Design a protein around this ligand. Structure first.
Ligand SMILES: O=C(O)[C@@H]1Cc2c([nH]c3ccccc23)CN1
Ligand SMILES: O=C(O)[C@@H]1Cc2c([nH]c3ccccc23)CN1
Ligand SMILES: *[C@@H]1O[C@H](CO)[C@@H](O)[C@H](O)[C@H]1NC(C)=O
Ligand SMILES: *[C@@H]1O[C@H](CO)[C@@H](O)[C@H](O)[C@H]1NC(C)=O
Ligand SMILES: *[C@@H]1O[C@H](CO)[C@@H](O)[C@H](O)[C@H]1NC(C)=O
Ligand SMILES: *[C@@H]1O[C@H](CO)[C@@H](O)[C@H](O)[C@H]1NC(C)=O
Ligand SMILES: [Ca+2]
Ligand SMILES: [Ca+2]
Ligand SMILES: [Ca+2]
Ligand SMILES: [Ca+2]
Ligand SMILES: [Ca+2]
Ligand SMILES: [Ca+2]
Lengths: 796, 793
């Protein structure tokens, strides 16, 4: 390495910064002796970090309070983000230690003029720094990095002298998961880089997503040296996916070919998530690409303050700066000339617009500044060590004249001081720091069309999980110009009345919506299953909620019921035209039956025949006391018996007072059978019919219907017997044709049941009570009309 | 590095082998100057590999057909599975190139420079060594590094290997998992460069093949007790019986010991190639925890004369090999506490150094050494004018450089002692077959043995690369039944799936298919919808056909209707069939025999129409039952109604015979007009009454039938009005009274069956209609002919 930044001093430090983005991308066939690689691109941020470190060292050497008489030198080389260059620089650093503490088999002699460094500033990448630390751990030389946040460097078993001044990015995955949870999504992507920074950083994110039940569509890995095949495959995978959110864990140059290919293919409508590595890189954030990476949300560190730095940055000159060997190359790259046209030392560094001269926040430079002062404070603590109170064995103390690397590492292990801003800086036993992570968004400046970063929130690491992040949605512009929150889900959420259904070969986050069948209802949206038991209710047409069932039965409240009751009471009134108001019964001339008894009985007999029809009307169980367990046969057992005794009285004169006792004996069998039935045998009722539809049915199904059939058959047989007995003498019309019309009156009763048997068998709306009551009422009207034909001839 | 194996020569080769499994674990507080670490336990497999390399070098140096005038030396250090120890050896190897490349430094010229370095046994150690060796373009060949991270040529330029990569092993394990009926498995990996890269591919394959993973954990050799306890608790609190392990011997040893201490059984263990045959875990005392373990092994090789060279090791005569002094002490438990002598036997003590059945890593080392020798021979034997360098130039064997050796090694193709061809790929990788082994218990020795139960191919198409013999696999060491490892039992027939919240797709519930649809396959995603003409079974297994009821003639009610119809036909033919004498008969008032056969055939046609009314609407394709609706209401009644018309005409006052056919004319023309206006159709839908399909008839403009019935009723009413004043007096065989009584019977029959028409049992409207028609016709014929059938003549 001919180019170097070397300054002499009593104590020598080591530094490694990236000045070039990469090396020549050429393959060697090894046909001849290989040569060293050559740089292709130039970096300006590394020069800024180098200048900041030089300024910090100079301020240390210019502060008598920090160090009275100690002068510190430095040796800085270039890495170019290459493992080989950093390994060569580290080997050159540890040559004095290598010749002495190593290679004991053979005698190795070297010049004493070369100095020995006490510490080496770590590299930027997480892979190069890993190799540098692995090689440095043999000699116990401390190494402090400023940009490595990989977890693989946190293992103290493999690395013993590695420290970092950048907060660990393990909380970055948690913050991204919380961001995804806040803007509720379930379909996301995953793109990482094949290195030591991307692969370990995606496992934690995937674990957090799985813990939060977040589905991942595709996961891909990219690299800077990959050719067109992998880039095309990744582009095809991205295009063939419906995920609108992509998580990217990569660097600037690593992601540059993918961004260029996407821009060439004009792929838009995607959301880009940026980590701290590439949230502010100038290689990706360009106006020409603003239509592909617009509205990008990224992570950034906490800004620092370095007084007297802007003025120092303008003092660089390629002629009066002999200590710095990179000034000439920086000048040539900035002014784009040779030292084609000749260039003198009379330009202005602030004319050309380059990132070296303009900046908004110093994060990595502040990290290097803090590391340099941490080393200075460790040296000061070594100098100020008091006898009798030390960190070595038996209370020993070190000598400032002869300081070894292991003593510096031991003193750096237990370090605590105050920052220039009043903060407290100390090193944890894992060699890691804790700091805030900030959220930034990309916007377009209307003035000159330049990409700018705006703060729209922050992440806290000193609070309990759940409320560690704050965000302001009103200041976030999605896709660069859109304000509404984009919709990125595998499928639409199920609405009310629909349930979920599995699709074969698909994850849990993807499903289908299926309408629930009858009898099932669901109120909450996206319900796993619908309620099955409506608690004696019915499912609605839309299955939104439950509906109470309807009770349908014959009642007097309905117009049909009130009309039937009015007809019944009218019939009761029409049989009271003699019962209620009676004509003279003494020496009655119209009827030969002078005696009031056995003839006045027919009045209240017909009254009971009419009144008994009111048992069937209304609900069977409407009243508790009047539950009417016997309902059917009571009407028959009295009315048929009265008809039979009347027919017997009529026939005794023609076919054939002890008659009153004689008529009752024949009908006594009906009454004793009914009394046995209605008391000894307790009838029941059927509460609900077959429980299928929303229309419920109530009915009174008397127990032991065979007894009812038997008693009806007995009554019919007795009626037929009396009809047959009356038939033999009804042909001859005598005595006001009395016997001639009773036969027709009771034949009306017979033909009522003949004409209403299909109504008994089948009825509309389960109204067997209605047909029964109308049949018995019509029979009662017929009997009443044809039983009092003698009164219409003569009033009295 | 005082402990080393050195032999000088014209050409020097480097080598690294693991002689110890690790180093002493102690924290450094930096109170004083740190000292070098020490290795605690000895290893015999690394010593066997070193002996194999020495034997190969000696065989090459004692062969005239290979490098006849060249002498080969070696320089081998110790690694102890430590990164720092290997880095020290790597730095010592590149001491000569340090002055030439870096930066002045003066060094003695007596020290030689190695041209090749044998790769390390580990993965991260090999990566660290190759990172430093790549600067000087020094070729390096490894024998046990199978990590994919070494397959990147951009970072590594002088790395070669003779072992298949881990991608094939992961694919084979995925195929094994897919072969068995398991979908709920675990995952355990080691925090190193061998385990983590070897689990991403396996997880991707499992996700592609629709395989769920229960838990994933990382373990390490230096992990404390808390991590081990957490891993054990996670494993115990799981329902998975199959566990995938990607770790080495010492890495997995603490976890195995902790599991044994807790006496955890009933688990299926899958072993990677790294620990499928390690003696640190395969112990009888742990057998009841690792019984029936399936592991992967490579293809063994044959090295004639190896055992004889192994059985002649001596700590005194082996001046070149300085590692025998410690090996003798370790294998005999002595030192040079009880004093020892150089007269013991090596065969006696049972050690893995001499007790072995196959050689896999040693064969790899032999192949690597022979590949290097073949490259050197090709360098020596190259002819001018056809060299691979620029302008056809060829190198000189007197002065050889590392880059030339690497270039010739990149293009290598030779043959083995077993008649096999060995080449090098563009990435320096090799391919080979795989073997599957199972762990069994010796019946008398009591030790763990390996049995071959199958193999995996790499030269065949996808899906036809694995062969498994189930008749030799013994699960759990003694069990025979195939283990069952599923999240939940599969749904039976007629039962569909149901989702559980916050659970993977591999876990679900079984819910019975509701009524109206069926599923005839197990683990059905959804219940298949039944067809229109089929209904779901009681058990919902499949669909069943429905039934149709149409009052067939074979029905008891149908045959009853038939028997009444034929009885009526016979009774009416008793009068019509026989031509009884009607000469000067006084039964009929009219002398002419006409106006009597009219009724006789009208009743017959009415009976025929009533009989034809029943049956299917489409029983006969010639004509539908439509006339059965019409004529039965006009031909049956109006022709009979002619007698009532003539008798009312007589009461009002061969001349009126033609004047009483008008009613039939108007009724038939109205029927024809209705039929042509909107012919009746047939309704065969289910009408949402029930699941049973019913057949019925529907006609447009149904009010026409009501109007026809109303016209008939009005005609009968006007007949009653006309005959009311004539029926009071009885005369002429009481014909008027009997006709009035017959028509009253007709009215009472028509109005008696009104609620049956309104509602009928079983939707048998046709049965009600035919019953009413027959009853009315029978009463009519029995009552109008009351005096015409009382006496035959
Ligand atoms: O660990 C790593 O590799 C990244 C490197 C990196 C970070 N921030 C940067 C800014 C510019 C350039 C590089 C970086 C943070 N950690
Ligand atoms: O790459 C690695 O780290 C492993 C190391 C290893 C393999 N086979 C072994 C047998 C014994 C000891 C160690 C090993 C295969 N690849
Ligand atoms: C980080 O943000 C929180 C939020 O108030 C707070 O602790 C502080 O302002 C920031 N810095 C540190 C060191 O916490
Ligand atoms: C997307 O799916 C998630 C799954 O939990 C859900 O919470 C979210 O509401 C869905 N998005 C929309 C817009 O409904
Ligand atoms: C376990 O699940 C798999 C998933 O397809 C299935 O093939 C297998 O039959 C199930 N096991 C049993 C015993 O049914
Ligand atoms: C690997 O197995 C296959 C099939 O059994 C066959 O090619 C041969 O036996 C093996 N091949 C090699 C190169 O050993
Ligand atoms: Ca770097
Ligand atoms: Ca970070
Ligand atoms: Ca799938
Ligand atoms: Ca090793
Ligand atoms: Ca392998
Ligand atoms: Ca979960």
């Amino acid at each position: 390495p001919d180019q170097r930044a070397q300054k002499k001093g009593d104590i020598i430090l080591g530094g490694l910064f990236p000045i070039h983005f990469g090396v020549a991308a050429k393959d060697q066939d090894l046909k001849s002796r290989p040569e060293s690689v050559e740089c292709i691109r130039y970096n300006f941020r590394g020069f800024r970090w180098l200048q900041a470190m030089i300024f910090a060292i100079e301020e240390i050497n210019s502060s008598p309070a920090l160090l009275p008489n100690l002068t510190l030198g430095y040796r800085i080389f270039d890495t170019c983000n290459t493992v080989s260059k950093a390994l060569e620089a580290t080997l050159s650093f540890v040559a004095q230690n290598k010749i002495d503490s190593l290679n004991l088999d053979e005698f190795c002699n070297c010049s004493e003029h070369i100095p020995s460094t006490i510490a080496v500033v770590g590299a930027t990448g997480s892979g190069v720094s890993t190799a540098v630390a692995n090689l440095l751990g043999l000699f116990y030389i401390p190494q402090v990095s400023y940009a490595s946040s990989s977890r693989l460097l946190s293992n103290k078993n493999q690395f013993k002298s590695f420290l970092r001044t950048i907060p660990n990015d393990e909380h970055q995955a948690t913050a991204m998961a919380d961001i995804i949870e806040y803007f509720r999504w379930n379909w996301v992507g995953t793109i990482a880089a094949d290195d030591d920074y991307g692969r370990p950083g995606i496992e934690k994110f995937r674990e957090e997503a799985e813990e939060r039940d977040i589905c991942i569509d595709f996961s891909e890995l990219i690299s800077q040296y990959s050719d067109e095949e992998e880039i095309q495959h990744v582009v095809e995978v991205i295009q063939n996916s419906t995920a609108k959110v992509i998580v990217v864990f990569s660097s600037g140059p690593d992601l540059e070919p993918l961004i260029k290919e996407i821009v060439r293919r004009n792929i838009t409508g995607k959301i880009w998530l940026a980590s701290e590595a590439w949230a502010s890189s100038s290689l990706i954030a360009m106006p020409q690409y603003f239509h592909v990476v617009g509205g990008t949300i990224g992570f950034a560190l906490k800004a620092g303050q370095i007084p007297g730095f802007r003025e120092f940055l303008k003092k660089v000159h390629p002629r009066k700066s002999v200590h710095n060997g990179f000034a000439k190359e920086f000048w040539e790259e900035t002014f784009n000339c040779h030292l084609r046209p000749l260039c003198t030392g009379d330009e202005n560094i602030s004319s050309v617009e380059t990132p070296y001269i303009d900046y908004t926040h110093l994060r990595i430079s502040y990290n290097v500044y803090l590391a340099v002062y941490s080393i200075a404070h460790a040296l000061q603590d070594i100098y100020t060590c008091l006898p009798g109170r030390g960190l070595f064995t038996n209370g020993s103390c070190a000598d400032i004249k002869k300081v070894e690397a292991w003593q510096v590492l031991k003193h750096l292990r237990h370090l605590n001081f105050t920052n220039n801003m009043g903060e407290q800086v100390t090193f944890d036993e894992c060699g890691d720091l804790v700091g805030n992570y900030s959220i930034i968004n990309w916007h377009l400046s209307p003035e000159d069309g330049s990409i700018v970063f705006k703060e729209v929130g922050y992440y806290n690491v000193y609070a309990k999980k759940g409320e560690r992040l704050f965000i302001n949605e009103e200041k976030i512009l999605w896709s660069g110009f859109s304000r509404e929150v984009p919709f990125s889900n595998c499928s639409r959420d199920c609405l009310a009345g629909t349930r979920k259904g599995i699709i074969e070969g698909e994850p849990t986050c993807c499903f289908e919506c299926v309408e629930c069948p009858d009898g099932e209802y669901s109120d909450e949206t996206d319900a796993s299953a619908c309620n099955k038991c409506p608690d004696d209710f019915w499912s609605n047409e839309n299955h939104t909620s439950c509906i109470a069932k309807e009770i349908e039965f014959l009642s007097w409240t309905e117009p049909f019921g009130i009309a039937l009751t009015l007809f019944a009471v009218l019939g009761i009134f029409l049989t009271a035209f003699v019962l209620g108001v009676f004509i003279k019964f003494r020496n009655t001339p119209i009827v030969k039956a002078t005696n009031r008894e056995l003839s006045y009985l027919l009045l209240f007999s017909l009254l009971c025949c009419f009144s008994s029809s009111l048992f069937f009307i209304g609900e069977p169980q409407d009243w508790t006391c009047r539950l009417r367990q016997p309902a059917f046969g009571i009407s028959f057992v009295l009315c048929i018996s009265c008809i039979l005794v009347k027919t017997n009285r009529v026939l005794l004169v023609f076919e054939a007072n002890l008659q009153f006792l004689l008529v009752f004996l024949c009908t006594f069998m009906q009454i004793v059978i009914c009394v046995i039935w209605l008391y000894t045998a307790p009838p029941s009722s059927y509460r609900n019919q077959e429980l299928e539809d929303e229309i419920i049915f109530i009915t009174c199904h008397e127990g032991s219907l065979m007894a009812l059939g038997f008693l009806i058959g007995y009554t019919c047989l007795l009626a037929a017997i009396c009809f047959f007995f009356a038939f033999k003498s009804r042909k001859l019309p005598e005595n006001f044709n009395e016997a001639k019309f009773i036969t027709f009156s009771m034949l009306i009763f017979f033909i009522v049941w003949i004409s209403f048997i299909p109504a008994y068998a089948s009825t509309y709306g389960k109204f067997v009570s209605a047909v029964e009551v109308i049949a018995i009422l019509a029979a009662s009207f017929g009997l009443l009309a044809c039983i009092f034909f003698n009164k219409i001839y003569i009033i009295l």
